Symmetry: D2
Subunit: 343 residues, 4 copies
């Protein structure tokens, strides 16, 4: 069984696929325990990545994966059948210069299960041993599934929060915009990784309440003049860092206007077009900084935090065959935190 | 005598003004030796700063100034009549937190001679002692005048090149876009301050030749598909840093498309609106970073470089009463390097 | 006009009358002292450790960790009036030299330092510069003000040092904080607030190890008992990513470099001991030894913010000014839990 | 199958036959050596300085600064075939541990180092990992290839150290580069290419001071003659922003910390001597002492780029392999101008 995109703007088809083949850079087959559903999956179905990615249809979605080793190629070391694992979403060579510098997402021969090739919305998936991080041998299936969103939502929030932390200090304000699958993790990470005052923005009451439970110092309903609210909270100074974990035209429109002098907007969500006068860029000396997933070391560090119990994903557990219900709900803002699908 | 903006989109009026008053934060009067003409002066006349600055008309323009001390308030130390000086363009308190951190342009009570108040297109100007940098006692009037553009064009290029250098390395490419008053200085500074391969872009043949004389490794005529040219020079990888020292809609349109993976666009020129899809911001993991003039330490470091003979401004010397001819020429692209006006 | 003054090295301070401070020049603020912290540097001062380097005129009043209330101000001083509660940055600087223009108060060319080389805060009143003043909330209680006194030197020093540490700490990294003293017990709290590192605190007194436990250390180690071996066991032989010496004795300067793992960094804050380490080990582990000196004005402001947020709190032992010599004796013996603060 | 091998410490290397290297496991490349640089570390090795730390099996072939031509490769190795000119990073690493995944080759858990602890390049052939190989332009002349040999250890070490230096250098800052040796003469060039600092070069031989002058040093200083006082005069008593010890003797380790100005940084590259400096000076000047260890693969690639651009060039003294012991004698005596490189 697998959930596959045959056509854009249609439901995924839940159907039988062949067992994955060990081949080429794919030397590990994982039995999926939990597969996170990302807003990127909505964008994928919508066709947003067609131009840039040009993938062969059909293919199985799912790029946020935990599971157990099923089978490995001869020569793969340190991995036996049954070993619990989390998967970095990039499959990379380790040979090009970016890889030699540790930047997995900038590797010249990158493949990405669930984005441009078959992913984890399936009973089994192939990946590379270089993408595997081993989890404690005794981890419970329940705890393992709970960690699935660390593989994409969490690692992306973590790298972005690392960026943020560089200019945050006590008394600094950070606006975290969008308390969603990524953003609710970022609220937690901002509190663990910086001493900054955290202002969380969203447009559903239950998500604002989730942000408070997770440590946000202030919450702002962005349906009601978010710039004015944030300017009030910051005594007209604006925020030192804003982080857009939504990426809609709406948020990309207003988030640059949250920034104070030498303010930085970390752009994580996508879909909208950035439009901002350069005279403001220079007169405020602000920056707009993309952040992309994260690297292997960053996933290892985030897994450590989770194992220490310092970050915990809010997870809504569903079955693989419920994927279309879950995607519909995610489009409508009806998923609190992160949905994760299980076989 | 002084050149003053009475009305927007009109020539400046060359007329008699009163001698400046020592008052408030203005405890130094300088006899102007050289006053640089900046493209910002065109933007000022056009009204671009009216909304953000709301200054009282008329006022004298000119924010790129060198001269000799004429008079100082009692209590001003280390400054006598006749001392040659260069002026940092910001007049600041030194008391707010930004100032205590060394960031003059982020000072909460900033004034800026020639931008929002009377400047240096005049025989005399008032400023603060905190804005003064003393030059060698024996400097010739000729050499002093040659240094005038360091006070704004140069310090702005220098801070921006400091930003650039942070991710440049041997084999890295930097595109420097606009070999103008600021940009021709930036070509020199890129070669002194980084080991990067410098690609200079402009749209007048003589400016491309100036860039070659100043050390550009490659030059590109941006009237002929600059993105394609730069992609060819960089074997489809793009540039590690692009620097926009033009700020027109034209350049803001194309400069983000010069960037390679983890590429950074340093935005210096202004006037255009930045418009770029977030899906590209994240998929390339690029950033867009404003740079604003520079701080007092940065001006001191740049003055050192000039005194070492490691940067030299290309200067077109004119009389104060020729200001309107010079502004017309600057609008039309007829000034090689930087015009400087003398009494 | 009572003050505690150093007249001779290796003798008790003299508690005596002195004239009221002169409001003049760069000394454009006089403060009525509310709380004056006692630092291990004060023992070093009395021992004569700073004579060679600072060559101060004797006698002078000690005390460089000060909070109080404005008494009066000179012309041109803005936003300060009699009664305003304040905490003082220990450096008195010009604001004109290049260091000052870059924001590094401790590297100002014309630096004077109340309590170190000129009269300080172990007195009813003390002169300083408005540039050294940070205003506290007008409503603060005297008790809370006094409890903040150690932030002015112990706290700011620990905070700058922890900022240095944080630059290479990450989840799963270990930091050894050595010396849970006046500075060190603050550093334990700051390492938890400012980094995600696993915190191992070392000391030689049981009550200081318990203090570190209450303040959030993940592990504590009694350094009378083979500290390097204990730290190597805790880190599975990898050593620590950052060690921080908040003691500075020969004993600690000798063992702390050996706590470091590969690319490890020793932040040296305490002083008195001589660093001695083979360069072959410096390069083969690629380690660094980095001094840290008090901190700058912005750093004191950030730290005051953390304190007002309730995220850092100093363990204080309050005594009267005229108990100064008894307190210095206790401090030399390791009998002050946290920081002693003197009040009028 | 000729090689220069260490059998006993404090004796000449033995020039003898050895079997051709075994292509196996992580050793998936064999190179025909074209040029093998001789490092001061080779004198330290023969002296037994590394025995304690590395505990290598004797005998083994020295030489860790190598260029050559691919001879053969094992399965799975891409983009390399017999005859390709190459320069070798001196570390042989797995690419799997966390250090490797972060790009720090020198901190890889399973690190092996040809010439230091296993057989090296003072031989006709040497085994290594494809991960250590950087391909040079196919057209390069043998003469130019050999001249690049020192970039593999002397150059990369100077380059990483200069990267560290550059982080706090600015126009008007001074850098003292101490030891215009095999590493140091490269560092002089790199300081000019990579920073805007004023470069003061120190050595104890006239010909090395002239070399530094030709390579662009702004000032040179004969360190037999009160180097600290001469540097203090050059800097108007401020000292240097960065000092770089490319000697590592007790003599230099003793004086180089005293070159530092406020917030100054000593980059320790040379080794052999013991660092000994008062902590009161470490904190009162807020100085740091920072080791630097060879460099990573990306850094070797950047340095090779600078060399191919003509922006750095090594001063080489070319000798035959079987002159190794005469060359080591000259090096111990300070009689090698630049870097000695051995050829077949
Ligand atoms: N850059 C990357 O590496 C990366 C990786 C993964 C996901 N993404 C993108 O990141 C974004 C977030 O993904 P996700 O967390 O799965 O989505 P999500 O779980 O659907 O969360 C989006 C959140 O935004 C909230 N929201 C909607 N409109 C507004 C508004 N106007 N103001 C404030 N909040 C609003 C919404 O209620 C929800 O909580 C999407 O654009 C993803 O495609 C980026
Ligand atoms: N951010 C700051 O602190 C700051 C300070 C000073 C000036 N400015 C701005 O910086 C910009 C440059 O000022 P300046 O150097 O005085 O102006 P300038 O001397 O008029 O130079 C502009 C240069 O851009 C070239 N140019 C025009 N169009 C293009 C094009 N399409 N592609 C490539 N090159 C082109 C032009 O030929 C000229 O050499 C202006 O927008 C100024 O207002 C910014
Ligand atoms: N660099 C600076 O800016 C700066 C500023 C202030 C103070 N200092 C110095 O910093 C050091 C700490 O000052 P303080 O906090 O006032 O001193 P303190 O309060 O006396 O604390 C010293 C602590 O070290 C503990 N200790 C003693 N020996 C050992 C040992 N072998 N191993 C582990 N712990 C031990 C001791 O029990 C006590 O808790 C002193 O050297 C001060 O002079 C430095
Ligand atoms: N950290 C590392 O990764 C690394 C790597 C390679 C070599 N090394 C070491 O770095 C040092 C330099 O190696 P090398 O360049 O091969 O040595 P070298 O070529 O023998 O150069 C040493 C230089 O120091 C000069 N010198 C000697 N005494 C003094 C003095 N008192 N003051 C100033 N100059 C003096 C000497 O004349 C010569 O020019 C040695 O200790 C090597 O073992 C370190
Ligand atoms: C926030 C102040 C903006 C200053 C504009 C400076 C432009 C120039 O110097 O040409
Ligand atoms: C350059 C590759 C782009 C990767 C897109 C990742 C989005 C996600 O993980 O949701
Ligand atoms: C633990 C690794 C030590 C490597 C020492 C390198 C010295 C040299 O390259 O000359
Ligand atoms: C050269 C300045 C030295 C200042 C030493 C500060 C020690 C302390 O604050 O306890
Ligand atoms: Zn995703
Ligand atoms: Zn790669
Ligand atoms: Zn549910
Ligand atoms: Zn200007
Ligand atoms: Zn200010
Ligand atoms: Zn002319
Ligand atoms: Zn103290
Ligand atoms: Zn100063
Ligand atoms: Zn070597
Ligand atoms: Zn490794």
């Amino acid at each position: 069984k697998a959930a596959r995109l045959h056509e854009y703007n249609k439901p995924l088809r839940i159907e039988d696929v062949d067992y994955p083949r060990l081949e080429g850079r794919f030397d590990v087959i994982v039995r999926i325990a939990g597969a996170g559903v990302c807003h990127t999956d909505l964008h994928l179905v919508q066709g947003m990545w067609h131009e840039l990615l040009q993938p062969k249809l059909p293919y199985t979605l799912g790029h946020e994966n935990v599971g157990y080793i099923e089978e490995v190629a001869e020569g793969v070391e340190g991995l036996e059948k049954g070993d619990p694992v989390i998967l970095h979403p990039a499959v990379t060579d380790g040979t090009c210069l970016a890889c030699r510098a540790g930047e997995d997402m900038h590797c010249e021969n990158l493949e990405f299960p669930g984005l441009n090739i078959d992913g984890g919305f399936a009973e089994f998936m192939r990946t590379s041993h270089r993408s595997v991080i081993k989890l404690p041998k005794d981890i419970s299936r329940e705890k393992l599934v709970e960690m699935a969103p660390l593989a994409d939502a969490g690692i992306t929030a973590y790298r972005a929060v690392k960026k943020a932390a560089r200019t945050l200090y006590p008394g600094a304000y950070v606006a975290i915009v969008g308390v969603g699958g990524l953003g609710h993790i970022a609220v937690q990470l901002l509190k663990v990784m910086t001493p900054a005052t955290v202002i969380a923005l969203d447009v559903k009451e239950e998500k604002l309440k989730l942000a408070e439970r997770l440590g946000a110092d202030h919450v702002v309903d962005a349906r009601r003049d978010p710039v004015k609210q944030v300017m009030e909270l910051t005594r007209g100074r604006g925020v030192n860092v804003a982080m857009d974990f939504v990426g809609s035209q709406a948020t990309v429109d207003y988030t640059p206007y949250l920034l104070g002098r030498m303010g930085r907007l970390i752009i994580v969500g996508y879909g909208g077009e950035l439009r901002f006068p350069t005279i403001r860029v220079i007169s405020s000396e602000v920056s707009f900084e993309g952040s992309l997933v994260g690297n292997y070391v960053e996933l290892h560090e985030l897994v450590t935090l989770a194992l220490q119990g310092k970050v915990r994903v809010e997870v809504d557990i569903h079955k693989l065959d419920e994927i279309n219900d879950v995607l519909e709900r995610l489009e409508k803002g009806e998923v609190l935190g992160r949905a994760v699908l299980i076989p």
